[PDB]
Design a binder for this molecule. Structure first.
Ligand SMILES: [Zn+2]
Ligand SMILES: [Zn+2]
Length: 80
């Protein structure tokens, strides 16, 4: 009897991959947000997809701008 074969490449090359494009952030830069690491051109709203650098609001673990966010949970009833 002869059986047994294993061997897989380790993808431990430059960890902390971009949580937006899934790309190793070694040659470029990263952005701290939601306990994650995103590129300077990847971190943007989830509803409008607008680059967030100045101010932003995170919801249920999702980056949002003062526009959508305030329009999603910010606005409610008529007088909202
Ligand atoms: Zn990226
Ligand atoms: Zn937005």
């Amino acid at each position: 009897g002869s059986s047994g074969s294993s061997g897989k490449p380790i993808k431990i090359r430059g960890p902390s991959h971009c949580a937006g494009c899934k790309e190793e952030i070694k040659h470029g830069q990263s952005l701290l947000a939601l306990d994650k690491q995103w590129h300077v051109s990847c971190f943007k709203c989830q509803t409008c997809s607008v680059i967030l650098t100045g101010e932003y609001i995170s919801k249920d673990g999702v980056p949002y701008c003062e526009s959508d966010y305030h329009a999603q949970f910010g606005s409610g009833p008529s007088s909202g």
